Amino acid sequence: VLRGVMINKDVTHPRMRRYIKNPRIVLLDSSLEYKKEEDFTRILQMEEEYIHQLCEDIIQLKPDVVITEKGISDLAQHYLMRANVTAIRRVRKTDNNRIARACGARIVSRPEELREDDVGTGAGLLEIKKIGDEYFTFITDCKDPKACTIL
Template sequence: MHNLIQSYIGTKFAFPWWKLMFDLALSAVRTAVRDQRGRKEVNIKNHTRVKKIFGGEIEDSRVLDGIMLNKDITHLTMRRRIENLRIILLDCGLEGKTGCGYVAILVFKPDLVNTEKGVSDLAHHYLLKGNVTALRHARKTNNNRVTRAVGATFVSRVDDINESDVSTKCGLCEIEKITDALRYFSFKTKCEDPKACTILRRSPSKDILNEIERNIQVAIEIERKVFFPPPVSY
């Protein structure tokens, strides 16, 4: 496999970093594997995401054992670093005018609530009382990757939350600012047996970022077809 990847990247710009490209592609393929009716499938498009961040060195690129999103906390006093956290994923908003639903969330003692909709001021009041961090307005596709990474279940109504819907497989959540990008990002890493991942790529030039992205994508396809060849019909 090393010789196969090296022979392809040998004529490309990323040849000096071919070993790094090999490790990134291999980690992404192994993470995205799932059993489908007795055979293994790799859905690179839906279960892996390449995140390009301008700045830094090419050697800073890595595959996260979890998911990275371009999201910041909704209130300045919320925690930015949480270890061994409990996560609740919602595809509904926290915008009700009564506090009954918010109290129902606090019963399960979550550390992080991730919702696709908005979070009202009243919801912030109850979440801050329970020392809960909230992330809002997340895309559906990104939340699907979060679900596979942390093992949580989407809940459509706050009243329908069960203990089985709460994820405890995420070891660390950090919301930090990357200086080169001038934006805040949330990192959900150290996940237990993640089935989705983020490939974080760094480079001092945007042109180099785009070129390396093409090389990584082809390396991923090569390794996917070698390790998990498609079925052959006779």
């Protein structure tokens, strides 16, 4: 048989890797978007410094995948994508919880509060394949059997 977690989601951008072995997973419950004289150029600069430092905080932990319960701005997607990091957004709180237990990650809010132990490594394979008309993400091969349910 097969064990792990299966969620009805796909990467945020097509270029991102849909197949990753021994994934370093990072779970979030916060949003990766921005919110809150030529104000335009000015607003673009404020937004960019935010997202940049948010992404830098995440990247500083060299993760393979970054999953969040909220959304991910297009700018953020590109920065993560530019660090070879796969991103999944709007993941159900429940699913996000199942993934946490399966790979041993700890869901965090602001990236800057991450530690090495927060990053989950109990999952040995992240494969996003297409079934029917929808895409599904599969997190399987758990360093701990019980830590994962049967699929």
